[PDB]
Write an enzyme that holds these catalytic residues in place. Structure first.
Site, short mmCIF file in Angstrom:
data_model
loop_
_atom_site.label_atom_id
_atom_site.label_comp_id
_atom_site.label_asym_id
_atom_site.label_seq_id
_atom_site.Cartn_x
_atom_site.Cartn_y
_atom_site.Cartn_z
N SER A 243 0.76 -1.11 -0.07
CA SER A 243 -0.12 0.03 -0.02
C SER A 243 0.73 1.33 0.15
O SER A 243 0.44 2.18 -0.12
CB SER A 243 -0.98 0.00 1.27
OG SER A 243 -1.75 -1.07 1.11
C1 LIG Z 1 -2.03 -2.69 1.62
O1 LIG Z 1 -0.73 -2.97 2.30
C2 LIG Z 1 -3.07 -3.50 2.24
N1 LIG Z 1 -2.61 -4.76 2.66
C3 LIG Z 1 -3.16 -5.62 2.15
O2 LIG Z 1 -4.05 -5.75 1.49
C4 LIG Z 1 -2.70 -7.06 2.53
C5 LIG Z 1 -3.20 -7.36 3.81
C6 LIG Z 1 -4.58 -7.61 4.26
C7 LIG Z 1 -4.84 -7.42 5.73
C8 LIG Z 1 -3.69 -7.26 6.32
S1 LIG Z 1 -2.50 -7.49 5.28
C9 LIG Z 1 -3.77 -2.28 2.98
N2 LIG Z 1 -3.12 -1.61 3.75
C10 LIG Z 1 -3.10 -1.70 5.19
C11 LIG Z 1 -2.38 -0.47 5.79
O3 LIG Z 1 -2.36 0.29 5.15
O4 LIG Z 1 -2.00 -0.78 6.81
C12 LIG Z 1 -3.42 -2.67 5.84
C13 LIG Z 1 -3.51 -2.91 7.24
C14 LIG Z 1 -3.80 -4.03 7.66
C15 LIG Z 1 -3.73 -4.03 9.33
C16 LIG Z 1 -3.04 -3.31 10.04
C17 LIG Z 1 -2.89 -3.64 11.50
C18 LIG Z 1 -3.79 -4.43 12.06
N3 LIG Z 1 -3.84 -4.61 13.49
O5 LIG Z 1 -4.72 -4.18 14.17
O6 LIG Z 1 -2.65 -4.83 13.83
C19 LIG Z 1 -4.65 -5.28 11.39
C20 LIG Z 1 -4.63 -5.07 9.88
N4 LIG Z 1 -5.65 -5.87 9.19
O7 LIG Z 1 -6.83 -5.53 9.47
O8 LIG Z 1 -5.37 -6.52 8.51
C21 LIG Z 1 -4.29 -3.86 5.13
S2 LIG Z 1 -5.32 -3.22 3.67
#
Ligand SMILES: *C(=O)[C@@H](NC(=O)Cc1cccs1)[C@@H]1NC(C(=O)O)=C(/C=C/c2ccc([N+](=O)[O-])cc2[N+](=O)[O-])CS1
Ligand SMILES: *C(=O)[C@@H](NC(=O)Cc1cccs1)[C@@H]1NC(C(=O)O)=C(/C=C/c2ccc([N+](=O)[O-])cc2[N+](=O)[O-])CS1
Length: 491
Positions: A243
């Site tokens: 991202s």
């Molecule tokens: C870009 O990196 C995207 N990532 C993905 O599509 C791959 C993943 C899907 C789910 C997790 S990995 C988008 N960008 C982001 C971002 O900007 O941070 C995420 C974030 C996911 C995330 C981060 C932290 C937590 N947490 O509470 O620790 C949980 C999540 N999550 O919901 O997976 C993914 S979409």
């Protein structure tokens, strides 16, 4: 015999950009011996052995099996004064040459950037290797003829002085390097993570102001050294940026002529079928999102639909122009280039994956450099690890209008929401990524006149993207204040 006797040269001083010493050649005593002379004073060996803390019989065995050899070291790189303790024994065939050993005053704090020297005072890692030719200088020469017992019989003809190596000023600021090292170390313990990297760049000069990695080592004490801990991850570890490349996908969209920030994409129902393949959003309660909304809701579906509309070629072009998967020109041996894939015909699956940062691999240095170009109104200044007094002309890689609009969008990413990257007193702009997870944050500040770009990579946090943002917030707040940047959240 006729023998060359090389005269050790002083290795060039490495400093901070402010002239703070990072690598200094220290005078040391190197007790050597002439076995052929030792062999005539064996009753003195046990004393000399005790002084060198060797076993009497192991020492004895060594000298005996080297009886024909005129030269061998007793203790290379011994400190002086201790070494004057052995010269004090007055043992036949036991001598001293004054030598130079590196000391690294900031030790572990800048280990990967500065690197260290091998046994022969030659660069082995980091700047010490990459500028070895500059730092080394030229050893001097004596040419001697020797006795049958290896003693110096004179006829020495035209001793050379020896040329010292030149001093080198790094782009690194030791005050920002300390702040980055301490916040990254604390982040890893807080978040129970394995490893990590943090790069700070000056967006106006291309200077790397800070480059730190965990784990680190003390280059003055490489006894129990884990190869792992020696890895300059910021320059060697390639990862999928994910991202954090969406700002570049948005740059291509805004330069296409087909997209402005207020245009809408329908991302409902948070998934998109590509033949068999299915692109999937993490939050899937959206229909219409504008381009800022796509970054705020972290929609892979939204960035994919824009990419299908503009073509992968335009996205490929911006990523290549900002240096992702491209040679950085720093010519650090072992530095990785990564992989930006290219196609004649970009299928739908590869178009979507490119746009949300899957299937390409970059270094933290490359990503920082790309954020630098975006922060510097689309102009890419050449990367430097040495202090830049005269700044080379940048290449305009994104249009100033597009870069300026994407800056604005990334400032609303940071602002519009609050808590969940904010840098109190300053407008900061940034983008999180999450790729066994990797937490990424890439950003720059201040928004009114960007000065710093920063990348935070954290490898496999356990105590749980949102592990990276607070490190960015803390290091950016400190770095801007150490650089006396005037706070820009003004009424
Ligand atoms: C870009 O990196 C995207 N990532 C993905 O599509 C791959 C993943 C899907 C789910 C997790 S990995 C988008 N960008 C982001 C971002 O900007 O941070 C995420 C974030 C996911 C995330 C981060 C932290 C937590 N947490 O509470 O620790 C949980 C999540 N999550 O919901 O997976 C993914 S979409
Ligand atoms: C996508 O998942 C969103 N981010 C998250 O909620 C997960 C997080 C990653 C790190 C922290 S939150 C949208 N994506 C982004 C982004 O591009 O990073 C943001 C984040 C908004 C935000 C709001 C407040 C603060 N803050 O602490 O001051 C920080 C962020 N931030 O992480 O960027 C829009 S949410």
């Amino acid at each position: 015999s006729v023998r060359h006797i090389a005269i050790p040269a002083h290795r060039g001083l490495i400093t901070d950009r402010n002239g703070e010493p990072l690598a200094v050649s220290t005078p040391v005593t190197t007790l050597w011996a002439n076995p052929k002379e030792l062999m005539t004073a064996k009753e003195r060996w046990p004393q000399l052995a005790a002084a060198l803390g060797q076993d009497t019989k192991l020492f004895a065995d060594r000298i005996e099996q080297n009886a024909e050899r005129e030269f061998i070291y007793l203790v290379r790189g011994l400190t002086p004064e201790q070494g004057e303790g052995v010269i004090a024994l007055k043992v036949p065939g036991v001598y001293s040459i004054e030598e130079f050993r590196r000391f690294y005053p900031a030790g572990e704090v800048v280990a990967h950037a500065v690197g260290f020297t091998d046994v022969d005072d030659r660069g082995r890692e980091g700047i010490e290797l990459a500028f070895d030719e500059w730092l080394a200088g030229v050893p001097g020469k004596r040419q001697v003829l020797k006795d049958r017992r290896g003693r110096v019989i004179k006829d020495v003809q035209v001793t050379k002085n020896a040329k010292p190596g030149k001093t080198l000023a790094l782009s690194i600021d030791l005050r920002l390097q300390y702040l980055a090292h301490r916040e990254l170390r604390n982040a890893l313990l807080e978040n129970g993570a394995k490893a990590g990297s943090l790069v700070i760049m000056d967006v106006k000069t291309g200077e790397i102001l800070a480059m730190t990695n965990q784990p680190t080592y003390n280059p003055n004490n490489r006894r129990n050294l884990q190869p792992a801990a020696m890895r300059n991850r910021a320059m060697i570890d390639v990862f999928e940026p994910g991202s954090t490349v969406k700002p570049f996908s948005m740059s291509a969209a805004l330069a296409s002529g087909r997209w402005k920030p207020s245009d809408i994409v329908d991302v409902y129902p948070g998934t998109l079928q590509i033949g068999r393949y299915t692109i999937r959003d993490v939050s899937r309660n959206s229909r219409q999102l504008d381009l800022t909304g796509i970054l705020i809701k972290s929609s892979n579906v939204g960035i994919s639909k824009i990419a299908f509309d503009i073509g992968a070629e335009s996205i490929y072009s911006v990523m290549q122009q900002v240096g992702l998967g491209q040679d950085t020109g720093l010519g650090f041996p072992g530095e990785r280039v990564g992989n930006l894939p290219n196609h004649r015909k970009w299928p739908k699956a590869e178009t979507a994956t490119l746009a949300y940062g899957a299937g390409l691999s970059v270094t933290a240095i490359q990503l920082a450099h790309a954020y630098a170009a975006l922060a510097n109104d689309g102009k890419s200044v050449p990367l430097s690890m040495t202090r830049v007094d005269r700044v080379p002309d940048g290449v305009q890689v994104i249009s100033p209008e597009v870069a300026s609009t994407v800056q604005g969008m990334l400032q609303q990413v940071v602002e519009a929401q609050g808590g969940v990257a904010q840098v109190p007193g300053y407008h900061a702009a940034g983008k999180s990524g999450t790729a066994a997870y990797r937490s990424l944050f890439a950003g720059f500040a201040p928004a009114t006149d960007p000065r710093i770009a920063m990348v935070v990579v954290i490898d496999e946090p356990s105590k749980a993207g949102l592990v990276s943002a607070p490190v960015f917030s803390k290091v950016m707040a400190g770095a801007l204040r150490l650089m006396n940047v005037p706070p820009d959240n003004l009424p």
